[PDB]
Design a protein around this ligand. Structure first.
Ligand SMILES: Cc1cccn2c(NC(=O)CN3C(=O)CSc4ccccc43)c(-c3ccccc3)nc12
Length: 293
């Protein structure tokens, strides 16, 4: 345990945000967590069970999350292990998951504090993609493999800060984004490359394939990839080499980055470093450049 511990009394649950098979997520006040703030909001994941399996899991997940600290990874603050339920404390991200954020700022579009009215602009869509790519750079740096990279598994906070992370309930909230195979096995097939579906191999390079599909989601304002297709039809068309078609809002410049992630041969896919650098440069480009993309 390099894991930070937080006393139960410093956490006051306000209400539920979300619910899964393995736990609930609450919004809470946390006291004496940061210097500038004696009181701040957090999201708290409470473990449903607390058995031999659940608690050695929990202890591992706590170690991994303590190790992943970066500007575009959901901030993990620590655990509360003084009397059940066991709690994991996280930064509260007020716009929820990126898929929901994308859908509620789509081409059919309520502007507010963080976002213009209307559909998100090119500038905004690129700044989102760029942030997700920044988190994928940091994970690949540590040779960590995600395996479920999707907009649903990103969050959005104040200022449209976008960070990779979920509460491990995406299977329950987004059951349609998964193919159920086993009795309890659920594969994000629409996000997976041919080597992951055929050979069951998962690598850095299946993560960049999955990021290319995140980039497609972003530029379709959260549409499900292959939504027109069933699970079996999507497997067929992915293993047979069919590529998702350019989203309306996606400049050719950007459709090419998407295609660099989707080379059939893993070693041919561009590196995440290269993709970040392309999206950041676009995101930071002056309006005069962007207006003619
Ligand atoms: C049960 C399960 C299945 C699939 C993904 N699961 C995750 N999710 C991740 O591990 C996803 N994830 C990265 O894989 C690393 S980035 C990152 C940041 C913050 C949070 C998560 C992250 C969990 C889970 C557990 C405790 C707390 C939170 C999440 N359980 C699951």
């Amino acid at each position: 345990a390099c894991v930070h511990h937080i006393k139960r009394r410093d956490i006051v649950l306000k209400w539920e945000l979300g619910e899964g098979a393995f736990g609930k997520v609450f919004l809470a006040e946390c006291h004496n967590l940061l210097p500038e703030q004696d009181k701040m909001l957090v999201a708290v994941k409470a473990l449903k069970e607390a058995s031999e399996s659940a608690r050695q899991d929990f202890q591992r997940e706590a170690e991994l999350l303590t190790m992943l600290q970066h500007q575009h990874i959901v901030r993990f603050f620590g655990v509360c292990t003084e009397g059940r339920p066991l709690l994991m404390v996280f930064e509260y991200m007020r716009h929820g998951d990126l898929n929901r954020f994308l859908r509620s700022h789509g081409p059919d579009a309520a502007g507010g504090e963080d976002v213009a009215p209307g559909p998100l602009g090119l500038g905004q869509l690129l700044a989102v993609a760029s942030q997700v790519a920044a988190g994928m750079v940091y994970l690949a740096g540590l040779h960590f493999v995600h395996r479920d990279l999707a907009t649903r598994n990103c969050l959005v906070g104040q200022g449209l800060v976008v960070k990779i992370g979920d509460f491990g309930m995406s299977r329950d909230i987004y059951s349609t984004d998964y193919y159920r195979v086993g009795g309890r096995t659920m594969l994000p097939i629409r996000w997976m490359p041919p080597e992951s579906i055929l050979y069951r191999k998962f690598t850095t390079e299946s993560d960049v394939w999955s990021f290319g599909v995140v980039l497609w989601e972003i530029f379709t304002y959260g549409k499900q990839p292959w939504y027109q297709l069933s699970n079996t039809e999507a497997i067929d068309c992915i293993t047979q080499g069919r590529e998702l078609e350019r989203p309306r809002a996606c400049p050719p410049e950007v459709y090419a980055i998407m295609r660099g992630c989707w080379q059939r041969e893993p070693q041919q896919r561009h590196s995440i470093k290269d993709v970040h650098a392309r999206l950041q440069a676009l995101a930071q480009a002056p309006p005069v450049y962007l207006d003619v993309l």
